[PDB]
Amino acid sequence: XXXXXXXXXXXXXXXXXXXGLTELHPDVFSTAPRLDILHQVAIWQKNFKRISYAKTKTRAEVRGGGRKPWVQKGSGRARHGSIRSPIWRGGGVAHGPRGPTSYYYMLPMKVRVQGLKVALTVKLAQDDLHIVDSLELPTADPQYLIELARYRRWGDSVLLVDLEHEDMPQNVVAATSGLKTFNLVPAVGLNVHSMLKHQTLVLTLPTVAFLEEKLXXXXXXXXX
Amino acid sequence: XXXXXXXXXXXXXVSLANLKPNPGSRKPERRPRGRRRGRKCGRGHKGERQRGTRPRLGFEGGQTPFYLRIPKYGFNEGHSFRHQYQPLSLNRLQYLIDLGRVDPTQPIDLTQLVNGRGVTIQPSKRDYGVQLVEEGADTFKAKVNIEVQMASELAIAAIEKNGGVVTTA
Amino acid sequence: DWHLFCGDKVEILEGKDAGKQGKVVQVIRQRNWVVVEGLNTHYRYVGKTVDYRGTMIPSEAPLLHNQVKLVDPTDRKPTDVEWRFTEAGERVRVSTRSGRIIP
RNA sequence: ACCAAAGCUAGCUCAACAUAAAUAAAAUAAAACAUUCACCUAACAUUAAAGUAUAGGAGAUAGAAAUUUUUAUCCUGACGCUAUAGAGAUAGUACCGUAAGGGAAAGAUGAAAGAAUAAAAUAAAAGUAAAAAAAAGCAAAGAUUACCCCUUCUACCUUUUGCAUAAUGGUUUAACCAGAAAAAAUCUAACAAAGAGAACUUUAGCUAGAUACCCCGAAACCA
Known part of the structure; x- marks a missing residue:
């Protein structure tokens, strides 16, 4: 049995501190990340969000009449039916989007679960994943966050998953206000799309706890 | 081995633009x-x-x-009014015994067999019975009670031989 | 809720004429612009053919209202408009700095 | 440089939410046709039963029921489209028909006329610019001169055993315009005697994704 040991650095996030120690055992890690699964999950996530509102009018749905513009023979002109025909510039298209549909589909649970798992592994081994005990934002201002990201040399895009959404106003207020770099989201609302959207992941101890619980229970349910 | 080789080199961090399907995944x-x-x-x-x-x-x-040009027979006539009975092998049963499933006599029943994912769903089968066809019964484990609708002769034989109890309902 | 009205002394914070102060001759709400006295001088042609004498006259071209700000009667400084109700029981527009009534 | 293109903006589709009476047919499908025909007129929610029980020139096709499973609001728009697209609509006007009815085309300077600022001026058509020494040419190429004569070659397309064919279609140019259906299978992945979001399959299966079946035209019938 190979046990992966990951070091969790506790940051009191005031300033000038990279010092912290916690021993983490992320059994959720996978040997080789699947690109195919991740791609399918991304494509699917892009797929069920489609509104499918594209509309047109077939020749039958055209306001124009179905009367014959002239006689079949003797006129000297070409043979023609109603002017709502697609061959006419007053008509529509037959193969057009007009008929509606739904571009989504039902993806197996093990596939999407293994997708989030593999993605988490990718972010893990990429050094872009950091674990903390807690989060503190006493001053709660954009300048503090920016200078923190610049001084601590974090990633260009960092996804912060900490809160259970039920507490800690001081953080959320400053974090959700006018910030392009950092994004916020509850621990129970963590998804693969959000992780792949950002180049850097930062999780806290409860977040990692619930995450590893959910992922170990899903891996144990998929193995059994 | 692939984890160490993927962690050793510094990649592009795998942006969404770097996502590519496996060869032959999607048809052109x-x-x-x-x-x-x-x-x-x-x-x-x-x-x-x-x-x-x-x-x-x-x-x-x-x-x-x-x-x-083909004559007619009652092959299709059956699928409507036939009385449905599902055969079960003793090999599956002893396998369930070897899987570490529930040992004691009292709790054992068809419901418990349903929870063990070892049963066949019969939604379209009306008047569903349960039967046991003998197989894999050589030197199978002992002291196990089984309750079924109608059990075959060799099934009751095999079960009773090792000390098992056959319950016919 | 409107910004500029005809007859007030206004200041310009943008353009070639920026910094200058002057009264407003006419306000058009169609194209959303104002005209300041003796500002943004441009050429205009009024000719006389029978008298053979053409006459070119300078005129004030309409300026965007977004580049123009009102002047408070007291502070005399350019400022934004705010809507308030005074103690006299009146609906008025005053400076965002002082309490002087613009109308 | 000439007729000319090129520069924007109205405008809307669709989803969601808010709010004085009386059995209609037929064409058609069954490559004819005659019993028959999902469908349409009004009431008809989801999963599964199930394309099953049955019905039918037992042909085409039609097709349930018993029974099963289900769920609280609050969270709005675009991997929809621009004058040939999207409604026909700057409009049911102009105009046509006795009538019912049918049904169009149509705007751009600039922040400001303050009327010479713009920036290209190349689509098919004639002007600046015609054939040129007694020479042949499905219209060019190899040579040759900064041009040409000489030599080497039977239009395209469609339809056909076979067309340069005196078989078919085309004045030219621009623009518009006609292969959108996964059962079984091959293939890429998930798990594996199990797969799959309480529904089915299963002596290696099961689930998901990805692969193949285009338009115009009657003479007539019925209301």
């Missing part, structure tokens, strides 16, 4: 436009095959159809 859908197959889109020259009005399937071209 063929478009009829081209000089590859001229103007017929693979329908050939004329005929009724070209038209979308082409004849329906199950048609031999006006000669007497294949199914019309």
Whole structure:
């Protein structure tokens, strides 16, 4: 049995501190990340969000009449039916989007679960994943966050998953206000799309706890 | 081995632009436009095959159809009113015993067999019975009670031989 | 809720004429612009053919209202408009700095 | 440089939410046709039963029921489209028909006329610019001169055993315009005697994704 040991650095996030120690055992890690699964999950996530509102009018749905513009023979002109025909510039298209549909589909649970798992592994081994005990934002201002990201040399895009959404106003207020770099989201609302959207992941101890619980229970349910 | 080789080199961090499918994952859908197959889109020259009005399937071209020359039997008559019974092998049972499932007599029943994912769902089967066809019964484990609708002779034999109890309902 | 009205002394914070102060001759709400006295001088042609004498006259071209700000009667400084109700029981527009009534 | 293109903006589709009476047919499908025909007129929610029980020139096709499973609001728009697209609509006007009815085309300077700022001036058509020494040419190429004569070659397309064919279609140019259906299968992945979001399959299966079946035209019938 190979046990992966990951070091969790506790940051009191005031300033000038990279010092912290916690021993983490992320059994959720996978040997080789699947690109195919991740791609399918991304494509699917892009797929069920489609509104499918594209509309047109077939020749039958055209306001124009179905009367014959002239006689079949003797006129000297070409043979023609109603002017709502697609061959006419007053008509529509037959193969057009007009008929509606739904571009989504039902993806197996093990596939999407293994997708989030593999993605988490990718972010893990990429050094872009950091674990903390807690989060503190006493001053709660954009300048503090920016200078923190610049001084601590974090990633260009960092996804912060900490809160259970039920507490800690001081953080959320400053974090959700006018910030392009950092994004916020509850621990129970963590998804693969959000992780792949950002180049850097930062999780806290409860977040990692619930995450590893959910992922170990899903891996144990998929193995059994 | 692949984890160490992927962690050793510094990659592009795998942006969404770096996502690529495995070889042969998705087919490069063929478009009829081209000089590859001229103007017929693979329908050939004329005929009724070209038209979308082409004849329906199950048609031999006006000669007497294949199914019309075949006599009739009660094969289909069965699938309606037949009394459904599902055979179960003793090998599956002893396998369940070897899987570390529930040992004692009292809790054992068809419901527990349902929870163990070892049963076949019969939604379209009316009046569903349960039967046991003998197999894999050689030197199988002992002291196990089984309650079924109707058990075959060799099933009751095999079960009772090792000290098991056969419950017929 | 409107910004500029005809007859007030206004200041310009943008353009070639920026910094200058002057009264407003006319306000058009169609194209959303104002005209300041003796500002944004441009050429205009009024000719006389019978008298053979053409006459070119300078005129004030309409300026965007977004580049123009009102002047408070007291502070005399350019400022934004705010809507308030005074103690006299009146609906008025005053400076965002002082309490002087613009109308 | 000439007729000319090129520069924007109205405008809307669709989803969601808010709010004085009386059985209609037929064409058609069953490559004819005659019993028959999902469908349409009004009431008809989801999963599964199930394309099953049955019905039918037992042909085409039609097709349930018993029974099963289900769920609280609050969270709005675009991997829809621009004058040939999207409604026909700057409009049911002009105009046509006795009538019912049918049904169009149509705007751009600039922040400001303050009327010479713009930036290209190349689509088919004639002007600046015609054939040129007694020479032949499905219209060019190899040579040759900064041009030409000489030599080497039977238009395209469609339909056909076979067309340069005196078989078919085309004045030219621009623009518009005609292969959108996964059962079984091959293939890429998930798990594996199990797969799959309480529904089915299963002596290696099961689930998901990806692969193949285009338009115009009658003479007539019925209301």
